[PDB]
Design a protein around this ligand. Structure first.
Ligand SMILES: [Cl-]
Ligand SMILES: [Cl-]
Ligand SMILES: [Mg+2]
Ligand SMILES: [Mg+2]
Ligand SMILES: [Mg+2]
Ligand SMILES: [Mg+2]
Lengths: 204, 222, 211, 225, 195, 195, 125, 233, 195, 195
């Protein structure tokens, strides 16, 4: 009934030293029934990464929508969109559906190509921007993620250390949620290289 | 319509060591968005080296604790001052809770102490009496924030040994009382940051063969 | 998810370990098998408290029976004490799904499904819980009367695993019991997080998942 | 908790920095002080997306209006544009605002509710911590306050909310708008809720997490040659 | 309607769909084909609310056939599935949404690969090795999770499908009057007349 | 608690200053006496948003009326209020008293309750607290009172309304409309409570 | 009433000329001189304030206009046409950009939007 | 289950160095009607306890009679009724707290919020709260209804924690209480200007002040407020 | 509309005579002034069945009290009313004013609203029509009035209550309680309407 | 449970009862005997709410067996049916009624006649040549109306019963997993093991 918890899933993002990390589980279900263990929730448009939790049809729809908009942005502007600008675009796009919203919990992550400054941001289903320094959480196990991140996180972590922190934050939070898990992916992002790692986790 | 239940917030945490046990809980008491008290003790010494906390609706929690303390008193009278073992106390509490199965004590109960072999013990209850011995258990408002952290940092879940890459798990080495208290404090500091009903103060009751000791720590008051 | 089936070597009982409150995983270490006596087992599904309380109570009634009658209680009589009890509380809101499994001389290996609606059914195979359908698939396609205690134990273990994977409200670990002419025998706690990858590699199953 | 306090030669507004989804804190350092125009600022309570969106829209139209009229914008213009917009949406746009600013007419202080009703005052408060704040304002406010006294009163009213209201917390943001001066935005004017050092470091040993696959992600465009 | 299954093997996609059409307390028909050929190498099965199912299927069919004629070219299964998803995603926020769940089984002639897509009425698309809609998956996914291997032969796929239908016939309360099975491969679409 | 009273030299409007959200006094110094024209004012009761929106629209209509046809009558102003209140009765909660001074017609008072109906009267009372002073006001009102008598009548009447009605309180504001001009009066608790 | 001119008033002549555009350029030719120069660290735009009367206050007439905080405009030709273009240019900078991306448009894209408005007046009915 | 009819608003209280202060206005509201203007909602029990009650007045009157009966019953066969075996605040509270929770458990509550303020035999300050749900808590400052939202913040500025109690004098505490009562009159739509205040000191005993009024009110600034935005006249 | 007023020589009870079933006046000459003892009477408002049943039970209790302990006080009578109204508050709808005359205590008035609470007062008003005369009665009441003054006070007060309240009407009944005895008064519409 | 049928022929009563026990989505059993022998020549089939069915049947069984022992005599089918009806008629006005429908097939040894009684949970008794409970009758009564003759043999009764079960298997949506058939005649009760 509650659209935000039919399919289930989670996303978490963190900042480190000259790097950002964004991660998500791979589960897609119909309430109790697990349907797919390859439903990725992180997408990217150039060097800007977007994670989306919530109702899966809207996750897919928005991805297609932001691909549409960022492709036109690039043709006209003759440059790739930046995280700060994309964040405003996501907010604008969501609020235009104020009284008929997409049931999602987006999370933007990336590094500004000009300033080199790491950037993360979260939103509610209708566009409110949460621009945190430390971390952003989203999904059915957001409470769990808040508790993991708030205790595990420390500022200025190196890429390979940040990987361990965000991976353990996601994994242990998902294991306390019935509608999350079934695999996980972690993106480690630096100014001009991105590494994608699939995590080994319990499949129940 | 009259609603006989309420939510007084708070959060509690029990951790069983090798030869000790702790039962912690914040001292904040609330209704809705108001603070009732910044220091309202929630974890109690019930005698016989048993500590108890009934988190949730404080009126039902105070009633239950009061009735269990009473049960300990009468257990001494009826059975020649015999010590009530933690396992026996747990079963007794199941019957207290299930006695009100159709008008429940709206509380998440936890007790802590030592078993009959001297090892640390924590028992966890749902509102209607189902119980289970556990090594680790958080209860109340911010339980969802704390338990995952404890799965990771107490039972070393999802943690493996470097170099093996997922093949060999991190070994389950025992934790000292000083190590547990660090995890308890960090749990409540983190919970206080992200949960509005958690804060003000942290009171920890530590149980050993020597008896029951108390420790208090300040928490953020916002 | 919990199952129990009769076969050549007695009864196999297998259960999961998960307990939830909504989407919140409350526990992964729950004991859903109740050792009523050396010959009787009780499985627990539905309300945790209802099942726990009334099945340990059942053990008190079974003990009182064999004190008064100087004879082990039958599986039929034991199951009916529980079913008659929950029937008195019908409408009040008890939530229980249970299999009463045991062996006696007069009956042999026997399984009764007992329900908070008052339903009491004797049978060879039962699967109960939110993930019962997943377990039924594996069981029905691989069940035979002529199974070895070793193979039967694995089938029960594998049928829970199947449900632990697909059913969101099932998982944690698998508890195995084997009931014979000489009583029940515990066959360990099996973590699903390790069992899944083990079964995937040896069986060659769960190819849809990547590992 | 958001407040507004008039003084001798201008007006000051203030706010806490807590955002909540139920009993959870979504953001610990939220910015509730919005800029409508250079010398017209408003604080917002209620639905976060609404206070932001409605402020930006009116701020945009105010800027265009200022360019059209070759005049500096007035607080009554922002007030009128906000209330008519909110009224039209019958309270469904959950924006509860305290609008303040200086303009050629003088210094002004108004409140706005979601249904479109406006109020005038020398001191105002809104939000879940408005009762804690108003208690402080009613106890300590007086006529002919100085700038230094008004900032103090304003931040004390926010603190009352921070401590006593669970819906409010963290830091105090302030903005001072004085006549014949630039408006000074004091982000995190007070920081009375810094987290204490943790007992332990939870930095993991590298290789602690189990990995299945690794791969480089192509973020660059299609290459030449 | 009730049960629709799909399984993608080595060189083909197999769709199984129940034959029953129950309208209340009566089984009206026991030979109903719950599928439409969208293109020579693309088949779509469907199940949901009465009327909406066929209306939607034939609407999609017409659109794809129109595309085929205009471009003198067959769309890839992936392209067809994306078109279908968008229609359902559009539909869910309409005045009266299409209450239809579909499986799209196609053979991509360019990549020489079978492809199975599961899409629900909300517009939730997933590519799978095997899929189902409604209560079918609850019984069948455990069997498939067990006996399926990606290099299976069409005959092995049919045997595994028989195992699924047998389990459904044993444990499901509703009599769905057997299934019509159809295979989609490089040579096109054909029906298994004995199952 | 609001009222408007005609007298020899013109008309006086009176009101309390309390605005409540349930039992919380959101504003204790509210101005419920609002100006739609130089010598046509109104008393507002009910929804603060609805009554403000209405008054703003009326002020706009009378400003535009004046630019074309010169100063409007109080009857005309009441008709504009009525038209808004009557035609939007399903969506409004507004109880307004219109009072104005002409030189030809002198002091006039029109009351517009919830339905949108118009009633011309010698004096009018409205708002939640008006209920408690129907008896007092009926017994103590006289036609062609002096300015000082009318001020005392309103002061005493609203004092009682405030005393008994929790929704009313604060200061008693008054606005005097005569040929002489527009005079604003205010009376504080210490003054009117001891009456 | 109704605008019954739904057809183009600018059309191709046999020679391929768009007459109304050519004539518009002739009007621009008659207009007062304005210029623009780009430096390494800035740009300058300038024009003559051709006062129509010495009694007129030429400060009230702004030939050079701010479009965004970082963009300015000047013209040659018909002043009233320029004035309305500036109004539309200022508004389109908000509606088609700032309200979407939360920042002011880059010069080339704002120019593109203005250009679009002027093209439409060359083809619309 | 019922609904409250004739009601009493905030009861506010705080501890200070040598005792406790409690206060409550003299109003009995009947919905929005301020019906009864002479209601005493502070009820002393002996010379060491004062019980402040808000909520339903008929239930308050019932509780008042229970307390009156409690004193009578304690005197029976008790030669030390006016000495060592006199009623303590802690005894009176626990009795009420038992009754409140019993009544809520029978789904027929006493629709009240009660604060028992007093001084114990050993000179310790007693201040504890109980309500219709049987919920109990203690704090250096306690308030009911609106007082919880507006009074507590002001009183907590004086006594923010336990260590501030010995530093707080009776003059400072009374001043804070009287100021809080004024604020509630400004902002509570169900308050009256008239109120009662009680001090229980371990040295000077029970001082019960009646017919107090809210004074030194600020209203003059109201004259400058015109319209709701644009209006100038 | 009911009221009881103490004065120098004792107390006077006053009431209207209207009983309504919705907007239909079921009885226009009702007697709402009822006797529970020689010089202890009550005014009844709310449910006619509830208030009659209560008054009958009280009269029985005070008759039995008198037989054992002699004449009861007015305070005692009010306590018996309260005990019934308080303990049966869930099932009753009764608003009663108790008034009586002792030689020791003289005239006393107790009001018992819906909840079952008791309030001793110099005078009391109750019933639906009392709302309209809170202002008038507060302004015009004085302590130690004469008999004639008190009759005029009640007559004028209830006249207004009747004028504004549709639930009130008919005749104004009054009962005078003094050392002299018990006097019944009646005032008809033609008399009190012209006031 | 689901389908229970009864048919009274020349010299016997035949009861057919489904074997399926479905709990929500799954069929937990496919060999359930929905009947109890009340006495050597009296059989009762039953269907209704889970738990209640068996609890009621066994309660009736016990009572009849108690009667048999006490009197050393078998009650007539008519007497047993009347006892059962009264229990259900008592039950329907209880706190929690038995939600059970029954067929009672018996052979009266005194009259040498088979007898079939249909009783629903309200306690509505009717003696019939053939009967059913639930949705079974909707399909089967038309066949029985057509092919039923009162002088039929037991073998002809079974053939007519097969035609009923075939129709049910064709047109009913639920898979009831066949029926257990039992014959009641002069020699007692026996089960047809192949049907
Ligand atoms: Cl207003
Ligand atoms: Cl009557
Ligand atoms: Mg699972
Ligand atoms: Mg706070
Ligand atoms: Mg009348
Ligand atoms: Mg029947």
């Amino acid at each position: 009934s509650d659209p935000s918890s039919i399919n289930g899933g989670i996303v978490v993002a963190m900042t480190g030293k000259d790097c950002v990390a964004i991660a998500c589980d791979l589960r897609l279900g119909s309430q109790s029934l697990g349907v797919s263990n390859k439903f990725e929730k992180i997408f990217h448009y150039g060097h800007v990464f977007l994670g989306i939790t919530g109702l899966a049809t809207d996750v897919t729809t928005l991805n297609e929508m932001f691909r549409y908009k960022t492709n036109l942005y690039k043709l006209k502007e003759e440059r790739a969109i930046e995280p700060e600008t994309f964040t405003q675009l996501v907010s604008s796009s969501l609020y235009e559906r104020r009284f008929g919203p997409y049931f999602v919990g987006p999370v933007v992550a990336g590094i500004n190509s000009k300033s080199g400054k790491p950037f993360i941001a979260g939103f509610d289903l209708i566009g409110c921007i949460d621009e945190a320094k430390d971390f952003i959480v989203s999904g059915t196990a957001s409470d769990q993620l808040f508790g993991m991140c708030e205790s595990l996180y420390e500022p200025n972590l190196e890429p390979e250390d940040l990987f361990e922190t965000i991976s353990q934050a996601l994994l242990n939070a998902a294991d306390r949620d019935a509608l999350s898990g079934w695999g996980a992916v972690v993106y480690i992002i630096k100014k001009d290289e991105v590494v994608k790692r699939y995590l080994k986790m319990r499949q129940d | 319509q009259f609603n006989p239940y309420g939510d007084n917030g708070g959060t509690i945490l029990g951790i069983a060591g090798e030869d000790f046990a702790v039962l912690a809980g914040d001292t904040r008491n609330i209704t809705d968005y108001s603070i009732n008290s910044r220091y309202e003790p929630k974890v109690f010494d019930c005698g016989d080296n048993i500590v108890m906390s009934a988190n949730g609706f404080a009126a039902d929690g105070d009633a239950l604790v009061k009735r269990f303390k009473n049960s300990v008193k009468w257990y001494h009278f009826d059975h020649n001052d015999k010590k009530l073992s933690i396992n026996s106390a747990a079963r007794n509490i199941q019957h207290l809770l299930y006695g009100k199965r159709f008008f429940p004590y709206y509380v998440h109960t936890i007790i802590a102490g030592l078993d009959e072999d001297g090892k640390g013990a924590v028992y966890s209850f749902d509102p209607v009496g189902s119980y289970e011995r556990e090594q680790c258990r958080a209860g109340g408002a911010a339980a969802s924030l704390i338990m995952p952290f404890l799965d990771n940092q107490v039972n070393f879940k999802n943690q493996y040994e470097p170099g093996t890459n997922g093949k060999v798990k991190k070994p389950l080495k025992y934790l000292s009382v000083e190590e547990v208290i660090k995890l308890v404090r960090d749990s409540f500091t983190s919970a206080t940051e992200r949960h509005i009903q958690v804060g003000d103060g942290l009171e920890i009751l530590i149980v050993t063969k020597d008896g029951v000791r108390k420790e208090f720590y300040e928490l953020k008051r916002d | 998810t919990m199952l129990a089936f009769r076969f050549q070597g007695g009864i196999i009982v297998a259960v999961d370990s998960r307990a939830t409150a909504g989407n919140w995983v409350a526990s992964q270490t729950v004991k859903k098998v109740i050792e009523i006596n050396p010959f009787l087992l009780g499985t627990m599904a539905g309300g945790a408290a209802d099942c726990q309380f009334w099945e340990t109570w059942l053990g008190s009634q079974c003990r009182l029976h064999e004190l008064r009658e100087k004879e082990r209680i039958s599986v039929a009589a034991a199951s009916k004490i529980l079913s008659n009890l929950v029937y008195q509380y019908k409408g009040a809101g008890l939530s229980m799904g249970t299999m009463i499994c045991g062996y006696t001389r007069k009956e042999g290996p026997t399984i009764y499904y007992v329900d908070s609606d008052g339903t009491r059914l004797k049978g060879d195979i039962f699967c109960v819980g939110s993930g019962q359908t997943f377990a039924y698939g594996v069981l029905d396609s691989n069940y035979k009367w002529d199974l070895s205690v070793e193979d039967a134990l694995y089938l029960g273990k594998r049928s829970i695993l199947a449900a632990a994977h697909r059913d969101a409200y099932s998982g944690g670990s698998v508890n195995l019991y084997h009931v014979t002419e000489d009583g029940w025998i515990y066959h360990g706690n099996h973590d699903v997080g390790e069992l899944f990858w083990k079964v995937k590699e040896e069986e060659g199953s769960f190819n849809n998942v990547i590992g | 908790t958001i407040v507004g306090v008039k003084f001798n030669n201008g007006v000051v507004i203030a706010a806490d920095t807590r955002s909540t989804q139920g009993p959870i804190v979504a953001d610990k350092n939220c910015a509730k002080l919005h800029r409508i125009s250079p010398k017209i600022w408003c604080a917002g309570a209620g639905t976060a997306a609404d206070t932001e969106a409605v402020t930006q829209l009116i701020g945009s139209n105010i800027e265009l209006h200022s360019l059209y009229t070759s005049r500096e914008p007035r607080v009554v213009s922002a007030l009128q544009m906000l209330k008519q917009h909110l009224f039209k949406y019958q309270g469904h746009i959950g924006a509860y605002l305290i609008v303040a600013g200086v303009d050629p007419t003088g210094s002004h202080l108004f409140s706005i509710h979601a249904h479109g009703s406006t109020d005038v005052g020398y001191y105002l408060s809104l939000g879940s911590g408005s009762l804690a704040a108003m208690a402080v304002l009613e106890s300590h406010w007086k006529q002919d306050l100085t700038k230094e006294e008004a900032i103090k009163l304003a931040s004390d009213a926010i603190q009352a909310g921070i401590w006593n209201d669970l819906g409010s917390g963290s830091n105090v943001d302030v903005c001072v708008m004085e006549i014949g001066k630039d408006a000074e935005y004091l982000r995190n004017y007070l920081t009375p809720n810094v987290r204490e050092e943790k007992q332990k470091s939870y930095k993991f040993p590298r290789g602690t997490t189990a990995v299945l696959k690794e791969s480089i992600v192509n973020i660059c465009d299609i290459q030449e040659e | 309607m009730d049960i629709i299954l799909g399984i993608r093997v080595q060189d083909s996609v197999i769709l199984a769909s129940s034959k029953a059409v129950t309208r209340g307390i009566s089984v009206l028909k026991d030979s109903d084909d719950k599928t439409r050929q969208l293109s020579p190498h693309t088949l779509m099965s469907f199940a949901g609310e009465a009327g909406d199912t066929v209306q939607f299927a034939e609407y999609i069919q017409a659109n794809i056939q129109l595309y085929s004629i205009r471009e003198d070219y067959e769309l890839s299964p992936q392209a067809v599935s994306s078109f279908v998803r968008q229609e359902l995603a559009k539909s869910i926020r309409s005045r009266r949404p299409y209450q239809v769940n579909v499986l799209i089984g196609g053979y991509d002639k360019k990549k020489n690969k079978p492809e199975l897509y599961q899409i629900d009425y909300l517009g939730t698309k997933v590519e799978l090795p095997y899929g189902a809609h409604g209560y079918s998956g609850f019984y069948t996914f455990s069997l498939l999770d067990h006996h399926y291997r990606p290099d299976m032969t069409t005959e092995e796929g049919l045997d595994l499908l028989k195992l699924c239908v047998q389990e459904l016939e044993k444990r499901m309360p509703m009599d769905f009057k057997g299934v019509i099975v159809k295979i989609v491969d490089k040579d096109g679409i054909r029906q298994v007349d004995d199952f | 608690s609001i009222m408007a009273v005609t007298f020899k030299d013109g008309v006086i409007l009176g009101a309390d200053s309390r605005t409540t959200t349930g039992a919380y006094i959101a504003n204790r110094v509210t101005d419920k006496l609002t100006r739609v024209h130089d010598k046509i004012w109104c008393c507002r009761s009910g929804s603060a948003a609805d009554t403000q929106a209405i008054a703003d629209i009326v002020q706009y209509h009378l400003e535009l009326y004046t630019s074309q046809y010169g100063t409007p009558s109080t009857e005309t102003a009441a008709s504009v209020f009525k038209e808004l209140c009557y035609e939007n009765k399903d969506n409004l909660t507004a109880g307004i008293i219109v009072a104005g001074y002409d030189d030809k017609n002198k002091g006039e008072v029109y009351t517009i309750p919830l339905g949108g109906s118009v009633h011309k009267l010698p004096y009018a009372i409205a708002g939640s607290g008006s209920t408690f002073i129907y008896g007092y006001c009926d017994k103590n009102f006289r036609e062609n009172m002096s300015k000082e008598e009318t001020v005392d009548f309103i002061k005493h009447s609203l004092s009682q309304a405030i005393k008994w009605d929790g929704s009313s309180g604060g200061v008693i504001r008054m606005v005097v409309l005569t040929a002489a001009g527009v005079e604003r009066l205010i009376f504080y608790p210490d003054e009117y409570e001891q009456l | 009433m109704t605008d019954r001119y739904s057809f183009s008033l600018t059309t191709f002549s046999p020679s391929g000329k768009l007459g109304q555009i050519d004539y518009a350029l002739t009007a621009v030719k008659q207009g007062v001189t304005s210029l623009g120069i780009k430096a390494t660290n800035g740009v300058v735009i300038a024009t003559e304030k051709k006062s129509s009367s010495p009694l007129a206050m030429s400060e009230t007439l702004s030939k050079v206009s701010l479009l965004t905080p970082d963009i300015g405009a000047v013209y040659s030709g018909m002043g009233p046409d320029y004035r309305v273009l500036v109004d539309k240019s200022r508004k389109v900078a908000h509606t088609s950009y700032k309200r979407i991306y939360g920042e002011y448009p880059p010069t080339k894209l704002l120019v593109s939007e203005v250009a679009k408005i002027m093209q439409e007046a060359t083809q619309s009915g | 289950t019922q609904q409250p009819i004739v009601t009493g608003t905030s009861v506010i209280s705080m501890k200070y160095d040598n005792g406790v202060i409690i206060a409550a206005d003299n109003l009995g509201s009947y919905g929005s009607l301020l019906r009864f203007n002479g209601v005493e909602r502070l009820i002393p029990v002996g010379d060491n306890t004062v019980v402040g009650i808000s909520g339903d007045i008929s239930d308050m009157q019932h509780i008042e009679r229970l307390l009156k009966d409690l004193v009578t019953e304690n005197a029976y066969d008790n030669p030390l009724a006016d000495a060592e075996e006199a009623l303590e605040p802690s005894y009176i509270f626990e009795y009420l707290a038992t009754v409140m929770y019993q009544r809520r458990s029978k789904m027929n509550p006493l629709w009240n919020a009660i604060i028992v303020a007093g001084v114990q035999s050993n000179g310790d300050q007693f201040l504890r709260y109980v309500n219709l749900l049987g919920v109990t808590y203690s704090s250096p400052t306690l308030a009911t209804g609106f007082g919880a939202h507006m009074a507590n913040p002001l009183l907590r500025k004086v006594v923010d924690r336990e260590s501030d109690i010995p530093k707080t004098t009776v003059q400072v505490a009374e001043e804070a209480i009287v100021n809080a009562m004024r604020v509630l009159y400004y902002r509570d739509a169900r308050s009256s200007r008239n109120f009662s205040l009680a001090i229980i000191d371990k040295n000077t005993g029970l001082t019960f002040k009646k017919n107090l009024q809210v004074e030194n009110m600020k209203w003059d600034f109201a004259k400058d407020i015109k319209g709701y935005g644009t209006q100038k006249i």
